[model samples]
Target chain A: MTDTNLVEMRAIERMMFDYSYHLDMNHPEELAALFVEDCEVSYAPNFGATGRDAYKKTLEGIGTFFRGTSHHNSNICIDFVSETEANVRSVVLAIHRYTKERPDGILYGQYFDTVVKVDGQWKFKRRELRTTMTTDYHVRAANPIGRAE
Target chain B: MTDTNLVEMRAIERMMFDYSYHLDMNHPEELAALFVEDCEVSYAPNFGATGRDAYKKTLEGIGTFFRGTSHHNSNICIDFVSETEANVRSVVLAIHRYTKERPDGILYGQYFDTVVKVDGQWKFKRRELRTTMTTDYHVRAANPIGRAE
Candidate 1:
């Protein structure tokens, strides 16, 4: 296997940042656009979906629950399996501010992702978030993907 | 627009990580080497300097002030202004523990930077830390660039 190209990995990193921006800006369509048609994502154990359509279906409830959100990406690491595919691990800290007196949530986690390039544009093919620590987080996982392992 | 070349960008990424490693490793002289001779740095309003010599002087007290420190860099965004120069924005989370009874400190900020390639080597030309949040941070109350301005 060959080492991942630094410039290429950084471009991937930029896409990840845009993912954060779209989520924070409450642009569901834009966020979903970052993934491929058959993409998979698991936020917590048993709390995930397969395919972009199913994932898009899940976002319908998030906007109504949180008044605002901030997602920060950090420590991105990537490995290229080929010119058009890569796997990435990134650290993330998110703040979810709930409306109507619900307690605000802070989540610290790592996102494991598989990315592929099609039509010269890169997108996530698989994604999972594994939490490390949190304060007043809104959800509970029986065991996150990484944690369970 | 052309995405910056991946290989070229990784070299720049290396310099950034080295800056962090040297700081955490307590190699101030080597850390200083990562910048141009006429670098500019601003930690807070009225708390910064111009020139590599001035920046080197500021490092003298940091080692003594903290028993140990960790600086984690995140969300590094680079925009090429030219073949030889780029502007970067990176988020940082730092932990500063004191040598004495002083409270351990946690700092959250973003580093805005100007990077230039000199003789095939990338170096920081300008850097400014704009803080967002903190807990028991030892420094005087200051502001991130936007709020301060």
Candidate 2:
């Protein structure tokens, strides 16, 4: 990879890191800013957002449903489609603890993302989450990857 | 970022990712090689290794205690101290599953590390860990972060 490629890689990687950070820190506005204005972010078939504002609105209820959450990212692989765009896949270990006496949820999943550069900044153009294994993880993907894909 | 800074960031990130991969894959020798010969790695006193040799030796008992382990890393922030050195702090979510009938241990913590270039490859000079919450995680740092310095 050239110097520019290496630099773009770091920027893209940091963008993904910030996605986890904003969600865990409960910064809905900051999280929304990571995506494009007309982004499509899907965690499940019926549970997702089609626009930046909709995604920000969805973040509002996360804190209410879960007392706390942690999303740990690993094995992020990036493939550049163009100078300004890249496709990414990453493994995530997540825990969603409920506010009430609900069983603590654990999810192992993969994030499929398409990122594009807009005004020299990398942002999610589109994003989808596919599950590998989930236990009590409230929202389920219509088609799970089924025990590690 | 400049070309030099960007290259350095990727090298440092890859080094940390390799740390988790080698440990989880049970490659003690490869994991030990990620550090300099005179590195200081402390998860806690009385349980940590003083140097690379001691570190590799301690890793021998890890698989004996746990059936499997996963260390998912996130939120890595690198602060360059020089052209060849940087300090990093990252969050980790670890699950250590026992071979026996013990409950699987879960740990949420931050890794405080100082890495420097060793023979053109970035290697850990010193690494210390501090925890947010640890359930059945045996190691405990007596002095964490050295007052965030």
Candidate 3:
């Protein structure tokens, strides 16, 4: 690998690691920086807010519902399409810890991620998440929100 | 990437994925084939049973425990140290479906992997299984003789 390639590789790893770290540490602001200023982050089921401003807000709201959350990414396959673009995919095991207030069980799944090389660095361009299987803690709703309890 | 480097990459992925598939399907015999004939697997933190013969036995024993298991690997980073050697690390997530016979809960963690090339084919030099966290349907004695429960 050339010096540039190696540097890019490390940048990709660092980007992924930072997202996971900030999210776990409840630092939504830092997590927002992982994306482009105009980037869009799709959270659950294809619902994504655009730009850093929206992304930070969404994360902050999510922080309230989830007491603890962590994404363990592995089996990372990064196919460098060009000097500035790559296709990335990894199996992501996402765990959302819960408490009495938010008694949801947990979340686990794989991630099919697409990363782009921006400004000589790699950042998440678009990330598509997939779940092979999932289960959530069964807690009775305090009040009907989406449907009748 | 050069032809030699490409081959090295493909070999390592095949080796690792093959081991994961058979292990999930409870096929210890086939799993053993992916390893060196006189191979050694480290489970890490008191998990792995060493040697081909012992590994087979351990796999068989696990098959007798859980109803089913599946391992998904992603975010795999392949570092080509030379034409014949490489070091890789990926995020690994394991999910197990249990029955009354065995009732251990789902397993969540990342797999720290080390791969080596043997005769132009890659084999696992060392595998460090780090369980980040876990939650089970039931918790039994540390050394439960039977299935998960």
Candidate 4:
């Protein structure tokens, strides 16, 4: 591998941030930039999207229901498999406090990501969104919204 | 390494998940069992704790504000620098949906972890938490009390 393997990995890391940022910020247009024009993202629990344009639409659709959202990344593992390929995986904590219907709701899960080297830059080729647990405003009186995330 | 490396790495990964499950489920007391009695966790954002007892206390303190939280781990890359030592880094996305405050909040960052082998098993020696970006929540709505921790 090149001496810049770590540098290349940094690019991959940045792409992950941009993905969460754009999605949570309601910037579907920008989210597409983090991937190749033909990239595909697959996730569990009723959804997967192929192609950048499709993924953008999916993100926009998800954004519509949320008044605001945040993406937190942690427990990331990265390795340079070869000169041109690398692998990545990490844990994700997401919360979407709503404005209208479910103002105090939260969604938390894990993200499995795959990145590729394209034109000297790193891009998110696939991401698997796995759900672990979530809570909505309806059940708050019984359980409190803690500071775990 | 050998095929044994994968098994040990997976064990370490599970240890991390066990830590998360306890923290997420309002059982911070269980955290004490995951790490060495004197293990320290230096999370990014310049926050961390030393000793298993202290870490458990921190987790309990953190469990007050989040309505619900989950940890997603994937793209794991483990490097065995030696038979008894390894370096692990993961890209983590933490998402939180608060009930009274920020509905959609996310923290995206990288985790720099150092795991050591003890008695033929691995445990966390230290984990550095680095946050690249975080979402903003209305303090008044999210923070019932003045203090976040």
| Candidate 2 segments exceeding 4 Å error | A1-3, A141-149, B1-79, B97-101, B118-136, B139-149
Model 4: per-residue lDDT, tens digit, B1-149? 55557556756766676666556566765666656777777653346788877777766544556665655555557788876677887655555645556555666556667788888667777777655566663221120112245
How many clashing residue pairs are found in candidate 2?
A: 0
Give candidate 4's error at residue B63 in angstroms. 20
Find the 10 residues in a row with the least total lDDT in model 1 chain B: B140-149
Of models 3 and 4, which has the larger lDDT?
Answer: 4
Output the lDDT of residue A43, model 3: 46
* True-vs-predicted CA distance for residue A104, candidate 2, Å: 2.3
Q: In every candidate, how many clashes are there?
A: 2, 0, 21, 57
Report how far off residue B141 is in candidate 1 (Å).
Answer: 4.2
Give chain A TM for each model in order: 0.90, 0.91, 0.75, 0.78
Write the residue-wise lDDT of candidate 1 on B1-149 in tens digits.
34344545778888998888888878999988888998999988888879999999989976787778898776777788987899987767688888878778877676789999999889999998877656677887554534211
- For model 4, what fraction of the real interface contacts is kept? 0.27
Q: What is the full ranking by DockQ, best candidate first? A: 2, 1, 4, 3
Residues A34-109, candidate 3, lDDT per residue (tens digit)?
Answer: 7777665654544667766776677654555655555776666777877777677665556776644543354444
Per-residue lDDT tens digits of candidate 3, residues B1-149? 56566557667878888888888877777777666655555554455657667766766566656777778766566777776667675655677777555545655444555666777667765566545445663422122111110
Better of 1 and 2 by DockQ: 2
**CA shift of A20, model 2, Å:** 1.0
User: Which segments of candidate 4 are over 4 A away from where they belong?
Assistant: A137-149, B1-149
